[PDB]
mmCIF file of C-alpha atoms and ligand atoms in Angstrom:
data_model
loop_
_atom_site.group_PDB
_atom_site.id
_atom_site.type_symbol
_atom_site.label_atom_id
_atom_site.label_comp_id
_atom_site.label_asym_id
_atom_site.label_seq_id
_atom_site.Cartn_x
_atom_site.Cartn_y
_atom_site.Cartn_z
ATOM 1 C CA UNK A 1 -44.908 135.746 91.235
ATOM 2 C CA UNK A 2 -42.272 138.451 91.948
ATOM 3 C CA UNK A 3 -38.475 137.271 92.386
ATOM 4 C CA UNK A 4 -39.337 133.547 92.232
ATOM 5 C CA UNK A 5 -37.785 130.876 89.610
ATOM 6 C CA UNK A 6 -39.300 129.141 86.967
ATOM 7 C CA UNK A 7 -40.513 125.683 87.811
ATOM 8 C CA UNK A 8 -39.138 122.469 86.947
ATOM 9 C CA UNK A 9 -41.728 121.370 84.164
ATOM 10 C CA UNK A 10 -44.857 119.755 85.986
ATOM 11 C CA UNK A 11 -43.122 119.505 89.541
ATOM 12 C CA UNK A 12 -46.389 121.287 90.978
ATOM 13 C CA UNK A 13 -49.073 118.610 89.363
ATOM 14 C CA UNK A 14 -52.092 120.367 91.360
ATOM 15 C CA UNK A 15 -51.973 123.853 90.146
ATOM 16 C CA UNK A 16 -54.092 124.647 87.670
ATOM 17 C CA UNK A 17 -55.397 127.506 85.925
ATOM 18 C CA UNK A 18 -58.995 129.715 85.593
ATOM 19 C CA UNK A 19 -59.541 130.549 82.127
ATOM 20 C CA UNK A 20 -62.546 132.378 80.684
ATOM 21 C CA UNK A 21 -61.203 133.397 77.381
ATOM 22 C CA UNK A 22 -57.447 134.151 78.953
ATOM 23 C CA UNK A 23 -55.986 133.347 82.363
ATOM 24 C CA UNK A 24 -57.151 135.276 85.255
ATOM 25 C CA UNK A 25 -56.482 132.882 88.482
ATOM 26 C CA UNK A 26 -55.407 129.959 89.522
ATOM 27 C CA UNK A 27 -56.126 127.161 92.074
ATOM 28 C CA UNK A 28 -55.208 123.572 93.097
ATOM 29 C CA UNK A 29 -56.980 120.004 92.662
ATOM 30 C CA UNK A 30 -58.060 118.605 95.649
ATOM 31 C CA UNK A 31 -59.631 115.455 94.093
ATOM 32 C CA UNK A 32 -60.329 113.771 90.752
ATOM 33 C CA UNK A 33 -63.311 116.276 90.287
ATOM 34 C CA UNK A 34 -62.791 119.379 92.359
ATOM 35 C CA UNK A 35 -60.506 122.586 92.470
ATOM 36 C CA UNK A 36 -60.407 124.963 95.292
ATOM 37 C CA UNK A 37 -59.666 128.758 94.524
ATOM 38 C CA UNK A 38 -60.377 132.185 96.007
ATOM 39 C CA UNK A 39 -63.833 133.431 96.318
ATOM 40 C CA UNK A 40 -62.893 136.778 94.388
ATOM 41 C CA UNK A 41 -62.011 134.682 91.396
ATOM 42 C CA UNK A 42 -65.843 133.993 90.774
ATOM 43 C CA UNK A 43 -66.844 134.002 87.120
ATOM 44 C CA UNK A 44 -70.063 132.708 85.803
ATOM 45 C CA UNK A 45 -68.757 130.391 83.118
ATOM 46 C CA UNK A 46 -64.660 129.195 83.823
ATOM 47 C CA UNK A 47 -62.670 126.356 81.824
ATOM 48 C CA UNK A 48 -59.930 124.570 84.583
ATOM 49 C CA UNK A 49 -56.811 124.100 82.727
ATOM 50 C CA UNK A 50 -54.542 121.231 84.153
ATOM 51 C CA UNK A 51 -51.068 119.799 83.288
ATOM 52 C CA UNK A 52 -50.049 123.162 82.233
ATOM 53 C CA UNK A 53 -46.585 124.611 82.228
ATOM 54 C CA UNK A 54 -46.293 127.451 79.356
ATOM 55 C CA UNK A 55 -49.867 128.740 79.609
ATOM 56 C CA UNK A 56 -49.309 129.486 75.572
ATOM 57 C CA UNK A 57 -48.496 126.929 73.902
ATOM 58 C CA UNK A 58 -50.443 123.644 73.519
ATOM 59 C CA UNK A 59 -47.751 121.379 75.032
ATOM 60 C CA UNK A 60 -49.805 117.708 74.959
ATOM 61 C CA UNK A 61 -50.099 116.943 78.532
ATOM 62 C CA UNK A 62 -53.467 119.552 79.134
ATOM 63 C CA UNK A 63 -56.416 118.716 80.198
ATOM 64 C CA UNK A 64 -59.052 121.036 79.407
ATOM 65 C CA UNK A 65 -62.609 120.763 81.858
ATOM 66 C CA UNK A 66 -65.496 122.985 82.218
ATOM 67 C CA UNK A 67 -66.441 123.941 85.574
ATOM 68 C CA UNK A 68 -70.011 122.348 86.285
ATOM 69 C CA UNK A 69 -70.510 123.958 89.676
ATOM 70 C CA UNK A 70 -68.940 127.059 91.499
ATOM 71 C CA UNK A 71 -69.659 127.627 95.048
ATOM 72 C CA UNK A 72 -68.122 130.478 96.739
ATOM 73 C CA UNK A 73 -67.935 130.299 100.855
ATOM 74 C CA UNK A 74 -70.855 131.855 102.317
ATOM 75 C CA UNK A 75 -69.731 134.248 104.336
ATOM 76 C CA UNK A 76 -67.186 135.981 101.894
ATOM 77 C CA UNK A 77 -66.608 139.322 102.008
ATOM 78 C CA UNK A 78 -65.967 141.358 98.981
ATOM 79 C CA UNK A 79 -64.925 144.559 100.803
ATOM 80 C CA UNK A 80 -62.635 143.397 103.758
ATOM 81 C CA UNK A 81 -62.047 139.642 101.949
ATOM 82 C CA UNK A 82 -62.596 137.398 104.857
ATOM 83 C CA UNK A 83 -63.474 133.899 103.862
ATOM 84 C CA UNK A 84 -61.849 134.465 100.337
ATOM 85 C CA UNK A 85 -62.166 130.370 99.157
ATOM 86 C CA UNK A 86 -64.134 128.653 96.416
ATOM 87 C CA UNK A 87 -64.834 125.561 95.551
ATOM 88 C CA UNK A 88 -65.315 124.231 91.839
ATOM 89 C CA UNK A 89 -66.303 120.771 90.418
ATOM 90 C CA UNK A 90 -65.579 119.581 87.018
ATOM 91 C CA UNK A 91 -68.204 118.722 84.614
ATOM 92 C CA UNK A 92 -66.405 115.186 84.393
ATOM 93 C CA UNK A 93 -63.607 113.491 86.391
ATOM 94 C CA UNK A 94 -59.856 114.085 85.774
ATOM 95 C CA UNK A 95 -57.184 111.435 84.374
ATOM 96 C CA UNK A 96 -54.719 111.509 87.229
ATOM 97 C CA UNK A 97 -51.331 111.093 86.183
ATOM 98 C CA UNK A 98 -47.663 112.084 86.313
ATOM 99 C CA UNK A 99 -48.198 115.903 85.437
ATOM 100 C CA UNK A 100 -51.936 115.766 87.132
ATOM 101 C CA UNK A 101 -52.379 115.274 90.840
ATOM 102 C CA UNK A 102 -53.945 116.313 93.971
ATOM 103 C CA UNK A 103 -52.701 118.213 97.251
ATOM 104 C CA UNK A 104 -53.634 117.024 100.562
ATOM 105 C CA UNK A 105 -55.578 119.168 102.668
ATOM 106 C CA UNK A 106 -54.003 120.513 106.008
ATOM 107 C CA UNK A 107 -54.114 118.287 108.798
ATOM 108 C CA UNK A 108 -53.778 121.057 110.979
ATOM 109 C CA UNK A 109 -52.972 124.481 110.831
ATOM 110 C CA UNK A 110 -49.277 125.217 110.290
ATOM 111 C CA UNK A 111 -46.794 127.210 112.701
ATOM 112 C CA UNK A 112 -45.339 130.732 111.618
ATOM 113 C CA UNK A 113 -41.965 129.705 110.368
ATOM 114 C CA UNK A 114 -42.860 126.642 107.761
ATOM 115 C CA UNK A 115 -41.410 127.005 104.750
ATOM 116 C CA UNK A 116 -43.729 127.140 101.593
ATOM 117 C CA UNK A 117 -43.968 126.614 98.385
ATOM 118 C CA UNK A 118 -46.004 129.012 96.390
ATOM 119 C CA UNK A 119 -46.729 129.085 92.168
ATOM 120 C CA UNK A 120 -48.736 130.648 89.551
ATOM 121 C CA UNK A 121 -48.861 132.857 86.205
ATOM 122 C CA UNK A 122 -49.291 136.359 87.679
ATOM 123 C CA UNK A 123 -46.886 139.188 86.997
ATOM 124 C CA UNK A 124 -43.234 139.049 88.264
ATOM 125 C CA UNK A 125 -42.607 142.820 88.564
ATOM 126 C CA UNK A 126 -43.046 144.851 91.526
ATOM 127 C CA UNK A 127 -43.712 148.045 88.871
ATOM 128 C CA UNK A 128 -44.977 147.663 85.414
ATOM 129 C CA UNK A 129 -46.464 144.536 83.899
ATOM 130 C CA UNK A 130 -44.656 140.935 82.869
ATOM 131 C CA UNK A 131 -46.573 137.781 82.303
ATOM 132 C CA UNK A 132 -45.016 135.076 81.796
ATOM 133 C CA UNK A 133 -45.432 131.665 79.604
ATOM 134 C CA UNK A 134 -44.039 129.616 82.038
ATOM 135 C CA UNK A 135 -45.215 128.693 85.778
ATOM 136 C CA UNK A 136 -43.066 130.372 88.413
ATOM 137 C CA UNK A 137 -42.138 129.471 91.746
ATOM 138 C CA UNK A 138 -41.334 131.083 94.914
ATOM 139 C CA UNK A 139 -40.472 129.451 98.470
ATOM 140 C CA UNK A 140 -41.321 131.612 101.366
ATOM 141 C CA UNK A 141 -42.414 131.148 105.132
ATOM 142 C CA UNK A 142 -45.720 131.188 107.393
ATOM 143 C CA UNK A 143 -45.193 134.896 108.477
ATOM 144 C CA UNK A 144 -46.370 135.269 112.823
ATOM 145 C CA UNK A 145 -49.722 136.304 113.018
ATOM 146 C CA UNK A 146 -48.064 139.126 114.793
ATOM 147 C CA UNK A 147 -46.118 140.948 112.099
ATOM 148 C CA UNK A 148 -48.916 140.284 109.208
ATOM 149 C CA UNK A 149 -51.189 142.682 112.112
ATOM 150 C CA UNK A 150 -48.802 144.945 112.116
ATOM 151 C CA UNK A 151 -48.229 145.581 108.291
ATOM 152 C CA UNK A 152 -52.088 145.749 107.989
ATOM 153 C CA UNK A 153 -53.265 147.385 110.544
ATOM 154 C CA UNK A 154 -56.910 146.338 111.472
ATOM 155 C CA UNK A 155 -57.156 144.466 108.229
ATOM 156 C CA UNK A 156 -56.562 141.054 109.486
ATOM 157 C CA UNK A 157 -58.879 138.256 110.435
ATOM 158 C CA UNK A 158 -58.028 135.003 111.997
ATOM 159 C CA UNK A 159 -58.704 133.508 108.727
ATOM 160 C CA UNK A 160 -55.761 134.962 107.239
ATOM 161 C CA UNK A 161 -52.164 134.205 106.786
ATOM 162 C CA UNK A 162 -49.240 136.132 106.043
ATOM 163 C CA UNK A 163 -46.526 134.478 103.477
ATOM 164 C CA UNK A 164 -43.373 135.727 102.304
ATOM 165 C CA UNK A 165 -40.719 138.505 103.623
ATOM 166 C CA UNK A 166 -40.837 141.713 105.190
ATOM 167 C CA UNK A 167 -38.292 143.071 103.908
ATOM 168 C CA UNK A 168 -40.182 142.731 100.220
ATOM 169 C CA UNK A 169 -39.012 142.071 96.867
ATOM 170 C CA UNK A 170 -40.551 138.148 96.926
ATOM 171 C CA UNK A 171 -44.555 137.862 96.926
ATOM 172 C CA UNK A 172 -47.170 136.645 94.943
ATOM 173 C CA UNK A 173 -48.927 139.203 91.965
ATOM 174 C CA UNK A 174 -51.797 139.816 90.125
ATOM 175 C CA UNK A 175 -52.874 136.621 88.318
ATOM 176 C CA UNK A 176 -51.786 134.419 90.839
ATOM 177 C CA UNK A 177 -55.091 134.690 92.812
ATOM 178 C CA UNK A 178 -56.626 131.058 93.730
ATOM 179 C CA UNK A 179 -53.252 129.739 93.190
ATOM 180 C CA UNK A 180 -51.698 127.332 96.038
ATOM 181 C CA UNK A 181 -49.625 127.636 99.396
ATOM 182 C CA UNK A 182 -48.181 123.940 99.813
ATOM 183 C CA UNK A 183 -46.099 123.375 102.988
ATOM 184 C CA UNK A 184 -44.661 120.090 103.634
ATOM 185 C CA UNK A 185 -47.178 118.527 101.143
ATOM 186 C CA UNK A 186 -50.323 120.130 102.453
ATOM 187 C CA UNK A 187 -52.503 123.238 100.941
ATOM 188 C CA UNK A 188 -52.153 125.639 103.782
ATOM 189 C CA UNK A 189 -52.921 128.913 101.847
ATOM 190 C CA UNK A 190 -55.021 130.451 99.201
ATOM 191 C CA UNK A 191 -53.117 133.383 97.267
ATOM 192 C CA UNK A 192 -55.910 136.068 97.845
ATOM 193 C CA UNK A 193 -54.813 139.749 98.621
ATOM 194 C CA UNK A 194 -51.655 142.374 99.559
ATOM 195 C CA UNK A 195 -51.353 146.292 98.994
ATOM 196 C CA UNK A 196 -49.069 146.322 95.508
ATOM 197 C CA UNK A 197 -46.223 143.403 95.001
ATOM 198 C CA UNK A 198 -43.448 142.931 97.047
ATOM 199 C CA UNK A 199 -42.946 146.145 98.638
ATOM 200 C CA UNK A 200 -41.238 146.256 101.709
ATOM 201 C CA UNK A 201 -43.519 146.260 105.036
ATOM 202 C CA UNK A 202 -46.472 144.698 102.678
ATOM 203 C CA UNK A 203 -46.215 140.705 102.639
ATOM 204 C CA UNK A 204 -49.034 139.109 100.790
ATOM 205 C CA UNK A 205 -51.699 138.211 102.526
ATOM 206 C CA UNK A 206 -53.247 135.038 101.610
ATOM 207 C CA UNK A 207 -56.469 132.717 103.098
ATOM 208 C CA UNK A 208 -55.748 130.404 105.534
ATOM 209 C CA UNK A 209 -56.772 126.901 104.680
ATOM 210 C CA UNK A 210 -56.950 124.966 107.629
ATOM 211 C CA UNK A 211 -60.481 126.585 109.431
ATOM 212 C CA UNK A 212 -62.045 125.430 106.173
ATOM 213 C CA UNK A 213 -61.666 121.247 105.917
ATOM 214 C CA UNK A 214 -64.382 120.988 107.345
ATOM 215 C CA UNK A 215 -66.553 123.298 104.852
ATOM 216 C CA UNK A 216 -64.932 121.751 102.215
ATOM 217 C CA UNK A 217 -65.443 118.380 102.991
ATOM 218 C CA UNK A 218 -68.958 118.678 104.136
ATOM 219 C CA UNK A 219 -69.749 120.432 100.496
ATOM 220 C CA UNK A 220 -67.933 118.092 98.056
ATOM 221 C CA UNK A 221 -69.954 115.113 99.874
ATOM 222 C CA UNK A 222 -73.415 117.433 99.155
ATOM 223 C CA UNK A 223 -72.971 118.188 95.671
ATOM 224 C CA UNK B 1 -66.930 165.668 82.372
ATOM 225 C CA UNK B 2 -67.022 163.944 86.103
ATOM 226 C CA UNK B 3 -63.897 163.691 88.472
ATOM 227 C CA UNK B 4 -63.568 159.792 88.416
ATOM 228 C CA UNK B 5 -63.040 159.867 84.772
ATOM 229 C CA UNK B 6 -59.680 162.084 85.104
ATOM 230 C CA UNK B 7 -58.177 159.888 88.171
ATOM 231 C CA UNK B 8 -55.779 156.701 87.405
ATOM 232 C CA UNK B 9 -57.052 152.959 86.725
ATOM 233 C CA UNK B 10 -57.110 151.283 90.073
ATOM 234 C CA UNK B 11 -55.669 147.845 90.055
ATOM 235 C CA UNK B 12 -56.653 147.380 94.058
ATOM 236 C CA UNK B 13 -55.593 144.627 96.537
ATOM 237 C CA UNK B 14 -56.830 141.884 95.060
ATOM 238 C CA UNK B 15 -54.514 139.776 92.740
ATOM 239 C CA UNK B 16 -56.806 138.497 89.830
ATOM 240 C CA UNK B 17 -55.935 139.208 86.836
ATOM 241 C CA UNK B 18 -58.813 140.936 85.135
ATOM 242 C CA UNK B 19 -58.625 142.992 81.592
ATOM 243 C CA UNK B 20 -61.165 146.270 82.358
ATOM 244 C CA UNK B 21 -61.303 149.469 80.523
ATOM 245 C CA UNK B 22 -60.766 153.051 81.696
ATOM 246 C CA UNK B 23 -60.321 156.299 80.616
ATOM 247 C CA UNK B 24 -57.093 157.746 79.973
ATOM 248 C CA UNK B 25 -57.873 161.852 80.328
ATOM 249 C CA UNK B 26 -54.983 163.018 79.114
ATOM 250 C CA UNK B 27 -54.833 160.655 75.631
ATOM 251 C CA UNK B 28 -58.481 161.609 75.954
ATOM 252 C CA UNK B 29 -59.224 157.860 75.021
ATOM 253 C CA UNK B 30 -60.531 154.557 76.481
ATOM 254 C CA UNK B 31 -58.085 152.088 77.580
ATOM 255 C CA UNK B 32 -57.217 148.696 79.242
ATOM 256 C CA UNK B 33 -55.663 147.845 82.762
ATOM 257 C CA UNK B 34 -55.819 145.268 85.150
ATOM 258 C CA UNK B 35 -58.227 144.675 87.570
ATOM 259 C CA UNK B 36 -56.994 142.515 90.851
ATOM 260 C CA UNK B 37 -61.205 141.728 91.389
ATOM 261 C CA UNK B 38 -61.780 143.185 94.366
ATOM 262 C CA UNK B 39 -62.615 147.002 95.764
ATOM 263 C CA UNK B 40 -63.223 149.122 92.226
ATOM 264 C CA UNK B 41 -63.700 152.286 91.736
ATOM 265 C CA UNK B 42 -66.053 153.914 89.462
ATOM 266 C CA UNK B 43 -62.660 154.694 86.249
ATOM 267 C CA UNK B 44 -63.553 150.745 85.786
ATOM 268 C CA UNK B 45 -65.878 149.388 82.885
ATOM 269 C CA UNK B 46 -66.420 145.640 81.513
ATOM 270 C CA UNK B 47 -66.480 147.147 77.619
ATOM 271 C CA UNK B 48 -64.955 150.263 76.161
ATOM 272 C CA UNK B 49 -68.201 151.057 74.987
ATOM 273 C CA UNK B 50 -69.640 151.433 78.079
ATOM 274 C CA UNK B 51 -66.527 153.471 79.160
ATOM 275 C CA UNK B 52 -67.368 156.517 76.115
ATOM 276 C CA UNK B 53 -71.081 156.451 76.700
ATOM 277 C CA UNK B 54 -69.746 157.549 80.769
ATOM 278 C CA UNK B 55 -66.435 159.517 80.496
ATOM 279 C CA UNK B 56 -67.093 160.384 76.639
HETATM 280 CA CA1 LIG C 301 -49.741 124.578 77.630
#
């Protein structure tokens, strides 16, 4: 996250993070036993972190799972990213709790102009390279379909969203892949894709959550 | 040696965060970057090893 704030210690309970020996992506918890994340996050063998704040340091309040099954969306697209969500169940239930909790899916989809909340441990410059230990935050709007066409020309499919400002300098980074777009309590957006960080005329682009309840309903009550 | 060897690690769209190794021409030497996960191009290798055996 570029130009955000550090969060207030566990005040976004449902992000987790993707490790496979270090942290690569994150995502949010859905229900006691499953995560949701973006499709390009797929590793064969990933351990969920939850209650985390300083990704560093063993604080006491982590929960550490192994993910028992990963199912990516069917009809993702590596080269264009269309359909860039992923669904992961634990190998065992969750303790819900204070600093662990769940996001509600959308009940609809959102209008351009809804203010969001987005988090993660990616990098917070626009040039060079700064992770941090703590969870950042950012707040940033639903972007009109109309402007995120026009800053990516062709490259837009009605399964994507654009978050954040035009005018750059705000946006989501590397590392914060999977990680969560929560508007007025509900999981509207995947972090997924953008050209760089926060550059002016180059929002991030991010996977719209409401075409897929259905999907993801139908598939946690299958598996 | 072959032209993708002496071009720049490619980070791409994509905002993983994934450790890959490259080679740095100029240092003449294999290196690490970050991957976003999405749309490499051939300067990208999962081990260094694998990285000298093809730009070596
Ligand atoms: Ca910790």
């Amino acid at each position: 996250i570029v130009g955000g704030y550090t969060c207030q210690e566990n005040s976004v309970p449902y992000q987790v993070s993707l490790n496979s020996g270090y942290h690569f992506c994150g995502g949010s918890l859905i229900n006691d036993q499953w995560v949701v994340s973006a499709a390009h996050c797929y590793k064969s063998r990933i351990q969920v972190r939850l209650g985390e704040h300083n990704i560093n340091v063993l604080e006491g309040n982590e929960q550490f799972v192994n993910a028992a099954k990963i199912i990516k969306h069917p009809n993702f697209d590596r080269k264009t990213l269309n359909n860039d969500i992923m669904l992961i169940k634990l190998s065992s239930p969750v303790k819900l709790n204070a600093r662990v909790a769940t996001v509600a899916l959308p009940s609809s989809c959102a209008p351009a102009g809804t203010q969001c909340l987005i988090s993660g441990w990616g990098n917070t410059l626009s040039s060079g390279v700064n992770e941090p230990d703590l969870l950042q935050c950012l707040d940033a709007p639903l972007l009109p379909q109309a402007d995120c066409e026009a800053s990516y020309p062709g490259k837009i499919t009605d399964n994507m969203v654009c978050v954040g400002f035009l005018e750059g300098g705000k946006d989501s980074c590397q590392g914060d892949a999977g990680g969560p777009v929560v508007c007025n309590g509900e999981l509207q957006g995947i972090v997924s894709w953008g050209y760089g960080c926060a550059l002016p005329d180059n929002p991030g682009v991010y996977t719209k959550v409401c075409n897929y309840v259905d999907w993801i309903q139908d598939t946690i009550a299958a598996n | 040696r072959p032209d993708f060897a002496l071009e720049p690690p490619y980070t791409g769209p994509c905002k993983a965060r994934i450790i890959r190794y490259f080679y740095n021409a100029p240092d003449g030497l294999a290196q690490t970057f970050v991957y976003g996960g999405c749309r490499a191009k051939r300067n990208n290798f999962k081990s260094a090893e694998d990285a000298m055996r093809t730009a070596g």
